């Protein structure tokens, strides 16, 4: 059984054959990885081998070096780095030599080079790589395949490694990339590959953009490629401009007027969609960058010091030119429209919205003309475009200024609701919703509020595309008619708003919309239920009775669906069934929080029985969540079901296979803790057993870990002293977690780290508070964790000295410092002050916009003061 033979078998559509080939390769690798890789690389490097054997060889090598799972990736790289340098050198030489010898267009060797480079560049073990790749591209004698394949490897390296790891070789890397992009280069495939590689290399080229001469060379070559006769190269080059504008905003004053404006404007007017999208994306990005600079401005302003970055207001200056192009682009809709399709029309719409929020009022005079001229055009394309434009600028300009405009347009908008074209009504329904959210006064009035409700109600019967948007509109009108029910002169709950008079006619109609032939587009059903959930939540007092009976309808419906298992067959009739159950559970969660407490006690027996029968996969998660809400409403009175529910809750936790349902369960424990308090002690040994098992189970999804650590805090709070038993295991686990470190290069792993850090902070908070007790007398048990105070403070110190953060982490850390003050007292002051970055975290929190971060950081600062002023 030659290796070439086995590799060719990896392409068989035969489950068994496919599995035989796999076991053999998995055994060879397990048996002797070094030789396995060397052997695979030999196969890949021989152009004499079939295309299939070579590609399969490359895939085996690749899968041995990297993984889409960040954790598995690091382990693979460590395993490779542990291989005899001589063996690795031989694999490296074969892969590198394969460049330019592969038939099949997408190169396999290119991916293997990158997988290895990701393990080695960060430890400086492949110094020969960059120069060889650079040489392959800049050698005038090199073939097209050779240059393309090499640029592909460069592109993959730039895409998969922390830019800071390539920073010291940016000069060389750029020489190769800028070389492949030159106008003189013969092959358009090489220019394409080179231009895609530049896009991935922009983050580590700062030192280069800081040099006037290098910056100018890069800009010239990129702008030059936007004029390449090859469309693919034109588009990629335009994307580089989009990114360059975003990363080097402050360096563009020099280029905007003499080149970028012209290039980006032309691109927008292109009949080639892909080109138009880049030109539009370019200006949408400028708006985003300028909006942020304004925020940065007001920031420093209220903070004293002057901003470090200052806007140039490119959006404002280009406004008079952008608007006419965007409004006309809005005219490029079509009968056959796709919602998840990102075309020039949709993009123009978003860009218009960003321009309005970036330039405010300034946009009205430029757009109003377009709107009046086409609001009545017989051509549905222009009529829709006009309505769309109107809706796109409702956010940004001053309300006071827009009120009269919207007020006067209402007659036309209402009529638009009855327009023959489905597209027009779709947009009309959306604009009505926008008005309710931005300029409510225009709708919630004693002249339009009635005809509006009338058309909205009638809209629920229109096509899904419109009915769905009408649901969102209703959803906002209620949210508006509610946000304008209180205030007055006191701080209490509303009583009876403008919809109360028709609150019921609406719930019944949404309930009917909800009863329409499924499979329907634009998720009508989901939208109606969602709308119902919103109108209920946004109901005043005098709505209670209506909400009461709606609660009964949901239950009955939930029960009628249960015994619907009579025609549950064929993957299509059951998918609507699982989502109906899912939609009703989520709905029950909303009315449950709106009815009185007695209503829950008079219904609890019914729901548990129901929710019980239901616990597919997506339904479980929804059932558990429904139970969480019932647990929050029942409170201690839930203890009654704990015996019958015990085995099921344990089920959700034990699984983990479907981390989603597992997460709802963990979340449920936390709710059980808050509802039962100490009464949960008898069930804790079991729950803690499963939770600890999940943690040490390296097969459990990563997003479950922090949810569990955070629950340790809820349990400690609920059981207090009884938590002593687990302290050793829990604190050891927390120390480990707290020391978790991901590559600050990955945004997804970074957010993960923040979530985890926040969860550790909450566990600590729960432990400290739980041991201290809920009285004006710090309980001795707190002292058990007293020798852990420095670690905690130090852990927060490091968190402080980390540009990542998040108001969430800052909030929890502030809360924890304050807890330590109240638990250990005076001595905590020295420890905090001996760690300067903590002080910075508190100041940072007191500035934050997040009320949680501002409240806790402020409360903590106070507690520390009391230690300063106490015996």
């Amino acid at each position: 059984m030659e290796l070439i033979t086995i590799l060719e078998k990896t392409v068989s559509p035969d489950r068994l054959e496919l599995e035989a080939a796999q076991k053999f390769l998995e055994r060879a690798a397990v048996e002797n990885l070094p030789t396995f890789l060397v052997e695979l690389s030999r196969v890949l490097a021989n152009p004499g081998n079939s295309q299939v054997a070579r590609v399969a060889a490359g895939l085996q090598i690749k899968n041995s070096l990297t993984s889409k799972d960040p954790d598995i990736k690091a382990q693979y790289q460590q395993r490779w780095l542990a291989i005899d340098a001589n063996a690795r050198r031989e694999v490296k030489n074969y892969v590198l030599h394969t460049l330019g010898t592969e038939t099949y267009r997408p190169s396999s060797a290119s991916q293997c080079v990158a997988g290895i480079a990701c393990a080695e560049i960060p430890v400086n073990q492949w110094p020969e790589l960059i120069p060889q790749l650079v040489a392959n591209v800049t050698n005038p004698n090199s073939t097209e395949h050779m240059k393309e394949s090499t640029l592909e490897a460069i592109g993959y390296i730039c895409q998969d490694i922390d830019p800071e790891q390539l920073q010291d070789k940016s000069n060389e890397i750029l020489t190769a990339i800028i070389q492949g992009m030159r106008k003189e280069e013969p092959s358009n495939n090489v220019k394409l590959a080179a231009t895609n590689a530049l896009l991935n290399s922009l983050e580590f080229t700062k030192a280069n953009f800081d040099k006037e001469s290098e910056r100018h060379f890069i800009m010239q070559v990129v702008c030059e490629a936007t004029q390449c006769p090859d469309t693919r190269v034109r588009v990629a080059a335009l994307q580089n401009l989009v990114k360059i504008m975003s990363l080097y905003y402050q360096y563009m004053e020099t280029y905007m007027g003499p080149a970028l404006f012209a290039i980006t404007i032309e691109a927008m007017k292109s009949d080639i969609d892909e080109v138009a999208l880049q030109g539009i994306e370019f200006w949408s990005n400028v708006c985003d960058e300028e909006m942020d600079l304004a925020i940065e401005a007001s920031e420093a302003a209220e903070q004293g010091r002057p901003p470090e970055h200052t806007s140039k207001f490119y959006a404002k200056g280009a406004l008079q030119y952008l608007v006419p192009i965007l409004t006309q682009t809005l005219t490029k809709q079509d009968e056959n429209d796709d919602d998840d399709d990102w075309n020039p029309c949709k993009a123009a719409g978003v860009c218009l919205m960003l321009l309005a929020t970036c330039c405010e009022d300034d946009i009205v005079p430029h757009v109003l003309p377009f709107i009046k001229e086409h609001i009545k055009n017989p051509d549905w394309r222009y009529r829709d475009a006009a309505v769309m434009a109107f809706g796109c600028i409702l956010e940004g300009p001053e309300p006071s200024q827009l009120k009269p405009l919207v007020i006067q347009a209402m007659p036309t908008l209402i009529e638009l609701m009855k327009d023959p074209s489905v597209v027009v009504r779709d947009t009309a329904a959306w604009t009505v919703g926008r008005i309710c959210e931005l300029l409510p006064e225009a709708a919630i009035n004693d002249v339009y509020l009635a005809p509006l409700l009338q058309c909205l109600i009638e809209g629920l019967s229109a096509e899904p595309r419109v009915a769905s948007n009408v649901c969102w509109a209703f959803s906002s009108l209620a949210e508006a008619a509610y946000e304008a029910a209180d205030v007055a002169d006191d701080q209490e709950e509303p009583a009876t708003y403008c919809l109360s008079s028709s609150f019921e006619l609406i719930v019944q109609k949404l309930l009917e919309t909800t009863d329409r032939p499924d499979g329907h587009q634009n998720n009508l059903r989901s939208s109606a239920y969602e709308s119902l959930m919103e109108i209920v939540k946004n109901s005043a007092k005098d709505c209670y009775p209506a909400v009461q009976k709606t609660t009964l309808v949901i239950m009955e419906r939930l029960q009628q669906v249960l015994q619907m298992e009579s025609h549950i067959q064929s993957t299509s009739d059951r998918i609507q069934f699982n989502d109906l159950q899912s939609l009703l559970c989520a709905t029950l969660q909303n009315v449950l929080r709106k009815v009185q407490h007695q209503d829950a006690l008079q219904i609890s027996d019914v729901v548990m029985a129901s929710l019980l029968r239901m616990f597919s996969g997506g339904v479980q998660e929804d059932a558990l969540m429904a139970v969480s809400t019932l647990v929050e409403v029942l409170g201690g009175e839930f203890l009654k079901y704990m015996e019958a529910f015990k085995p099921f809750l344990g089920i959700g936790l034990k699984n983990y296979a479907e981390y989603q349902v597992c997460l709802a369960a963990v979340g449920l424990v936390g709710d059980l803790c808050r509802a039962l308090q100490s009464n949960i002690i008898p069930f804790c040994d079991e729950v803690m057993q499963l939770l600890l098992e999940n943690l040490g189970n390296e097969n459990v999804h990563r997003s479950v870990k922090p949810q569990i650590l955070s629950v340790f805090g809820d349990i400690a709070l609920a059981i207090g002293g009884e938590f002593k038993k687990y302290l050793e295991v829990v604190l050891n686990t927390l120390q480990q977690a707290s020391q978790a470190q991901v590559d600050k290069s990955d945004y997804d792993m970074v957010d993960y780290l923040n979530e985890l850090r926040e969860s550790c902070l909450e566990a600590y908070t729960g432990i400290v508070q739980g041991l201290k007790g809920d009285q004006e007398n710090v309980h001795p048990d707190v002292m058990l964790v007293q020798p852990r105070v420095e670690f905690i403070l130090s852990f927060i110190d490091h968190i402080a000295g980390d540009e990542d953060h998040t108001d969430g982490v800052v909030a929890c850390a502030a809360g924890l410092i304050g807890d330590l003050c109240t638990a250990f007292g005076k001595d905590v002051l020295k420890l905090v002050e001996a760690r300067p970055m903590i002080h910075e975290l508190l100041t940072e929190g007191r500035r934050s916009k997040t009320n949680k971060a501002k409240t806790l950081a402020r409360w903590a600062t106070k507690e520390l003061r009391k230690l300063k002023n106490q015996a």
Binding site: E530, S582, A586, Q589, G618, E621, D622, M625, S628, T629, E632, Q660, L663, G667, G670, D671, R674, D714, L717, E762, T765, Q769, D774, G815, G818, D819, T822, K852, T855, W859
Partner: peptide, 24 residues
């Protein structure tokens, strides 16, 4: 299925917040 999780979570985190607060 997005709001069913992410939104029901916010409302939960708030449970602890108001809990720790009216205790702190």
């Amino acid at each position: 299925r997005r709001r069913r999780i992410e939104v029901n979570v916010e409302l939960r985190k708030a449970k602890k917040d108001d809990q720790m607060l009216k205790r702190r």
